[PDB]
Symmetry: D2
Subunit: 498 residues, 4 copies
């Protein structure tokens, strides 16, 4: 308490006088220009909103801990995964297509973005609730996400646009099958699995390399909603998943996931019968079994959602020694894209915000810019220098690299022995799903096609028969009878759509 | 078609080569840094989103025409309202609290933002679907909107926060009554009325002044949804109102509103028994009857929702000769706030975008800045100048002014004879509502209070009894029995709320 | 040192590997897209620059201390000026017209921007090296600064534009005289005086008010350069003043200024023979003598020029209890303008950067926005609230206010008994300047008019004769003979100018 | 003229009333918040400045025409270079290190940025006034430019920092020699040559490839200033070069350059004795002679410097069919960097501003974003689509590609037979310079080393002896006697520098 305090301050720390009445010429007069508290508070209010993420705008998260309980030191030198290591984490969950205020229970992919605050930097494993994705080249991703959003004239989501894109990009079949199956509607974020999806590189202390897949298996199980249930919840509680996570942690019910990897020897990655660098493919667990690493626990809610969750900036470029990227084109595009988006969304100094700062000392050659909170004093701005300010200069092949040879080209990845666009989707439908799941799948896909322009429907019938002839005919028969479920979040047809 | 065309271009107009595959070192190699088409398209994608409006993020609109059919020339010299004049319009409708992807059918105020493209500039009448508002001083508005949005930790909307603000700001009673009544849930935007809410100033050719209220009465009638219906629609079709407007216009069903004004002689504005400069008050139609002006028709959908609707920038500062502001503190704060927000949301040159440009010639002393599309060539940048580049220099009292006298103060407006916080709300509940509307009102208010922290509930019981003793007791009795409707868009209680 | 350290890190804290070579496919191959260190460092480099200040882009500063050595407690309750108080300060000096890289020794006004880090907030006294300014209404300021900058087509500064503006705004005469006199070219910033220029309000503990002027009198004296010397230095050392200040402090030569005020009783401000609210007027020291307050010492250089000086954000709105604004229209426009500019130049959270943070606790109703470093946790976002988070609600006349009465108008300030545009300038030329200063003045003004378009020259001859008939004829005679000094920073004439 | 016009408008097109007086409560009262014209004009003024370019902030330009007068169709299919073709151009000249207001005649590299508005897109040849550059890997460029700018604490340029960087990066020797020679100080931009510097790829109609160098040889000759002359001009006219170009064109004196190429057969680029992909190397004209293409004429000044020159956005990524990049690492980094910078400096839609738009039709998959002036209507946002909106999908090796093979590495380029860091610099000093140029060179280099920290001086003596033993000893002898010229724009020594 200062001597002239009034209960709150302006931005300069001086007493504000009133948070409730403007400065006027008498009670009945106009507001004067020099009501600086009115101006400061309104100008700030007008700058509170920041661009929402594209994609994955709607989401929430929590802090936790990861504990290593197995010895995988023969596979990586990364500090975070050494025996017995416990690391603080942050996890943000999200949908993909919907905007900031959109219902949580729309049918969609869910994000699973996990940061480990390691002793050698922030390691981000930016995953999804599926082991695969719709595409295998990042040039197509902009198109895909735009097709999942809104028509340019009416501003409506449109299943015709969605199916036009999917049927003209048959590489999408594996993930469209997974999305249209049970797991398209998680009951809660606690009751879904997380995956890295991509192949990553692990490098051990001797320089030996393995290609790895990450799998986070929920200790709460996998539980899903029906289309009808999810539609009902979208109306009753648009923030159902956000509320569930916060309430669960507040009550002491800390959700857990066990991490397993698959580890492929370096040379076998080049010869395996499915392309491990193709994001539309899973790798068989009969060929490369899951190996346990440790357990993730979420146990602490945010104190401020905007500062800790909305302003968090995750990136697959945030690797640490012992972990690298891979020849997966999609992953390589992601190495550029996230940081770029965050410079616009948050700001140049996004990585100086507390939630994005690493625990270890940063000594980075970047200076100045807007909103530079932690300046470098008189440190040298160039290298080499004669002033004792260190720099890096390792020469030669990098520890997390690989070989390439060819001419500059734009073409599809070469096919391995068993690669195609529809086989793995067919295995999912025929061998993994139960009879009841298959029945529900038909009703979901048929519903998703209701009202779709007939030319696009016809292409969808061929697409589904390519996945499985029996399921495809069942879908076609139901579409021709105009049957099927309503799908939460999207429809087709009418004068405002294609 | 250029000789080396490929089907699309980069931003410089050169052939893009592929919109589907990235540039790699052989089919199996990494993406190269110099895939400039990948970079341009991803960097643009990452900058597509702009901050959503605060408030009124969720909305849509259409173009139309306004036709003057009466002679109100004795009241204003504004060109747009002279006899027989037809003017092109743009109208954006919206909710208030929810974000970009939020359901259209939440209980809320609706915006009614109307632009007239006049021969003497763009005239914006930025109204709502209610003649009043919650507050009478703009210092409180930031607080109010934050209370209608989300809790800082959990990110959830919370009825306890909403009622804590309303009960501690009893000036809100008139509009809270209107919001909790039938009109809180319009069936469609076509089936709601629009209002200017504020008193504005009209000035005629002789300089005579009248205080005016604007009323847009729907030719489609006023039709509303129940809480249960609106909740159901929120789940089934989050864009119901947006879809309805677009489809209606596309089918040729052009919605209309008739404009009426109330006209108060200048001196009577200072003595009237309710304060016309208090936005929480209506002016009796027995004292000042409605006078017809003309008819608004909406008849054309946008070609591009983002460019024409999302990027539209409406402002009450966009007056034209013959129409001015008034001593209403809320209006005077709005004269500053919109343009300020738009400089951040869209950009410095927001008013050069086609939808925001006026039809008449702009000759304005503003130069340079980012994204300056229509430059001024070698025009003088200062005034007076000796180069023949004109400027304005009218001296003396302005035609759209008024008098003031007093000392600089922060205090409430003085009360007129019949001014108070609860009387007009009481008239609405007792005399305007039917028995069925009163019954529904009790169920709505009781529902809105379910789960609210008990101290805040107790203050709400006193608030409602101040409006009407009978309705207040009915609400209290239902709250104590834990009865009432679910309210679309909000709830209270639980570990994630207050 | 982490186990895999290389000498520097990326932004996530992981080893950077090399600050000297890019990631390529072999030594001879292309750079890959996933060189994340190349991308991070280049994207940051590309965002290092921020908009320069407009005006006052070119400048530098230092930290120091202010010590009160007199008792002025009968005049103000402000903590910073109570007996014996010592306060940390920051001072930025600058020119006005030139851009970031422009020479320090151009003829121009110099800024004198002083921050006191008080126990009741940051108090900014944003002054200049002159007691007056060119204008008395802020509407003209945009025009004035544009006239001092560059022609729209050629990008050159132009004396014709400068004189066209000055001669058509005769209120400028007092300050143009001061600028064209000796003090237009300070030798160093240490050897110039500083002034608040405007009348400010001081309020004591009993609520009694005085109008005050601030004067900072250099203990190093006032020393100036000739036009020829300053031109020579502009070529030899464009950063002469910046270098001088830094070197002087580094050598232990701490420059000092003594602060004096003039104190006008509240009622006398309304009746005084020169308008104290007209920024083009000085107040006679025979009528209101200077009263000593204390001494300012600069004694510490910045550690980082960009973070501490370039990113500093000074504003006349940063008052503290005991000190207020005044009816000076120019000051009232400044209360809005600085904070507005800083939101664009630096960012919404400009006042959270260390150099802009106050020493006392900030409790302000502003939340969210880009780059929010110091979040508010779960503090209530609205007022009043029932959660114990305080707010301000003082009602009634403010302690730093005054009275007004009238109709809304756009017109010049009424003239006091002795007010005019040329009298004070004439006193300066006839009574204050020495013979040698008058001789130099003629050569400066004549030089400044060389090459100016003849119609504008003719108006300038009348302007100068209005100041003083003898000096005006001397200037005219020299201009007609094409004599006069070269003026550092500007010229006229030729095919690229008016 | 509208009926109520006053001489100028607000941004909405309504009469502004006054560009000279603010809206107040009586003549003596405060400014009201609702002076919307004051607010609009000041908010715009506060947003006029945009970040200056980094590097090359200080510059100007003109429009012209390029005319092909020879037949080089066997070497390229690019439309702009086909026989007889005339193309509109824009050329911006600049320095490198100094900021927006810095003198034109500092010793520095000059930029030569040329746009051709071709029928197949905007082709930008972003060159300099030297055939080489200081570095051969873009990772070092950020460091280099920071070393040429200012010290972090004092804000001064410092020759010690400059020489510390150069001597620790000996690849710089060739260009440092050129900079310190006669051509470091062009008399005018009309009297300097322009170069592409890098090797580019040309592809003919049959797909045959040649590596090319571009040389623009001034028809006005090469003329330079001494250090002393340039220092004098920096003080007298900081905009000498800008003024010269504008005045010359205005008087009808249109400067010309003849374009010549060197053409290296594709396979010879891999075996040549100097690395054509190393930007620090020239290619001998005895081995690959210059071949004339045509003539560039500048003949039209800008109408608005800010809109046409400051807001121009040039990029080496703006290739057209027939012209590609090359394996030069520096060029490949530039393909990313310019567009990235321009998104921050100007905006997402930088390429929709008139000066940046191509002449041919743009059909690009980019939508939305701030300040989207030319929208795409209802065009499909995804590909392939079934709506007739075209896209590109060429598969296989690109016409402007090449081969690569290797492992991911960070290392220096392999040396060709005659590659080293000092040989070409030595040829310049011994064989190209005259005796008088050598004498002046010694005085320039010695002057540039005056005051430099002794350890860095000692390294510079070794550096220069590596260039040439005789010149190096001459420089050392002069430095030890503290002799040498003052260098315009930079110095060393003293308490404010290293
Ligand atoms: C002092 C009180 C108010 C403040 C400070 C205020 C401020 C704002 C702001 C900053 C925006 C966003 C503008 C943009 O980004 O383009 C907005 C939107 C809007 N406000 Fe207000 N408002 C207030 C009162 C009102 C009232 C009383 C009404 C109705 C009479 C109203 C109707 C609207 C509408 C319809 C929109 C959306 C315009 C559109 O569709 O783009 N506001 N308001």
């Amino acid at each position: 308490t200062t001597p002239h305090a009034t209960g709150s301050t302006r931005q300069n720390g001086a007493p504000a006088v009133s948070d409730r009445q403007s400065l006027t010429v008498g009670s009945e007069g106009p507001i004067v220009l020099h009501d600086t508290h009115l101006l400061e508070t309104h100008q700030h209010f007008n700058r509170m909103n920041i661009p929402e993420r594209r994609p994955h705008a709607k989401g929430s998260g929590a802090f936790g801990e990861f504990e290593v309980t197995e010895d995988v030191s023969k596979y990586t030198k990364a500090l975070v995964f050494q025996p017995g290591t416990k690391t603080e984490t942050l996890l943000r969950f999200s949908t993909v297509a919907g905007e900031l205020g959109s219902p949580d229970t729309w049918r969609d992919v869910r994000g699973f973005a996990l940061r480990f605050y390691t002793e050698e930097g922030n390691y981000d494993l930016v995953g999804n609730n599926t082991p695969i994705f719709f595409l295998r080249d990042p040039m197509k991703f902009t198109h895909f996400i735009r097709s999942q959003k809104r028509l340019p004239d009416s501003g409506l989501r449109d299943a015709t646009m969605q199916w036009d894109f999917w049927t003209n990009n048959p590489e999408s079949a594996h993930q469209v099958t997974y999305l249209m199956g049970p797991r398209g509607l998680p009951r809660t974020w606690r009751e879904m699995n997380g995956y890295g999806s991509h192949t990553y590189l692990w490098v051990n202390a001797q320089g030996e390399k393995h290609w790895v897949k990450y799998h986070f298996i929920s200790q709460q199980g996998v539980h899903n909603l029906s289309n009808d249930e999810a539609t009902k919840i979208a109306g009753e509680n648009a923030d159902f998943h956000r509320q569930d996570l916060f309430e669960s942690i507040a009550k002491g019910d800390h959700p857990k996931w066990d991490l397993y990897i698959q580890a492929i020897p370096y040379e076998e990655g080049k010869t395996y019968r499915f392309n491990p660098f193709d994001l539309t493919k899973t790798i068989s667990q009969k060929d490369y079994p899951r190996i346990k690493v440790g357990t993730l626990t979420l146990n602490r809610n945010p104190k401020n959602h905007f500062a800790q969750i909305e302003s968090a900036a995750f990136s697959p470029s945030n690797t640490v020694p012992g972990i690298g990227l891979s020849p997966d084109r999609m992953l390589l595009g992601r190495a550029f894209a996230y940081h770029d988006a965050q410079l616009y969304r948050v700001g140049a100094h996004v990585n100086q915000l507390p939630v994005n700062r690493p625990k270890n000392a940063v000594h980075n050659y970047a200076f100045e810019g807007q909103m530079w909170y932690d300046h470098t004093g008189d440190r040298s701005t160039y290298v080499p220098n004669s002033n004792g300010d260190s720099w890096s200069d390792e020469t030669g092949p990098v520890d997390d690299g690989w070989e390439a040879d060819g001419t500059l080209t734009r073409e599809a990845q070469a096919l391995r022995a068993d690669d195609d666009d529809f086989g793995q989707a067919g295995t999912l439908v025929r061998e993994v799903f139960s009879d009841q799941e298959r029945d529900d799948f038909v009703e979901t896909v048929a519903g998703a096609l209701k009202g779709v322009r007939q030319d696009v429907q016809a292409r969808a019938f061929e697409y589904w028969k390519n996945v499985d002839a029996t399921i495809g005919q069942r879908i076609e028969d139901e579409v021709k009878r105009h049957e099927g479920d309503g799908i939460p979040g999207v429809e087709a047809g009418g004068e405002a759509r294609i």
